[PDB]
A = this chain, B = another copy of it.
């Protein structure tokens, strides 16, 4: 089987791939330090709950990229019969191996970082427990079935079937984000910053299943190095600037979020 050090060497040796992971390790790390410094003045527990939940997003992110760049959460899988990338090979150093580079480390950690994005947003919008629970549970289900899709190599049909279940879970999250929380925000007095984050979230999040479908996991029209940067670019907005904006607001409106 392929070795962890080999995937690690495969990431290096490939500038596109290496830069998409190592840059976000630095960016997530700097984001954490920046965010902690920005909220060192909060005093209200609810505002502080929102801040910590937000800060956890890049915390999980930095561990995710370290797991990917270290080769710990990457594997070489062979696609099933009729998969647009079946018969492909990867080549580690001087050897060649059948399969595609499957970076499942992303799908796995999303199940931990996205619930946190949703938690901060829901709270910021004055959501009640029932909606938080719904958004979060289905969001986690979306991430897990997506991971399952990437890890399934027995059938091409199964892969897209998992993908469909994940899409169904995704619409549930979309519904509360666009319909439910958009209304709550007004009642909480945060409609302004929410609108911004909601639009940002929805637009960025929609990009993930597109990239998945266009990359080696899907119809393989994009290389692993390209698909990886697309995700990394999405992360920079959906996580880092998204967190900067929320915490920039939060620190200037601690009283309104206090309740």
A165 within 8 A of B: yes
Q: How many residues of A contact B (CB 8 A)?
A: 46
Tell me whether A129 and B45 are in contact in the complex, defined as CB-CB below 8 angstroms, given that A62-B165, A141-B59, A148-B67 are known contacts: yes
A184 to chain B, nearest CB (A): 11
* Cβ contact within 8 Å between A134 and B71: no
A155 interface contact, C-beta 8 A:
yes
Question: Does chain B have a CB within 8 A of A46?
Answer: yes
How many angstroms from the CA of A145 to the CA of B64 in the assembled complex?
A: 10
Q: A128-B45, A148-B72 are in contact. Are A154 and B5 (CB under 8 A)?
A: yes
Check if A185 is an interface residue, CB within 8 A of chain B: no
Q: How far is the CA of A77 from the CA of B138 in the complex (A)?
A: 33
Q: A70-B155, A72-B154 are in contact. List 18 more A-B contacts (CB 8 A).
A: A3-B153, A3-B154, A4-B153, A5-B153, A5-B154, A5-B155, A8-B155, A9-B154, A45-B128, A49-B129, A52-B130, A52-B137, A56-B137, A56-B141, A63-B144, A63-B148, A69-B158, A72-B152
Interface residues of A (CB under 8 A from B): 3-5, 7-9, 45-46, 48-49, 52-53, 56, 59-60, 62-63, 66-67, 69-72, 80, 128-131, 133-134, 137-138, 141, 144-145, 148, 151-155, 158, 161-162, 165, 169
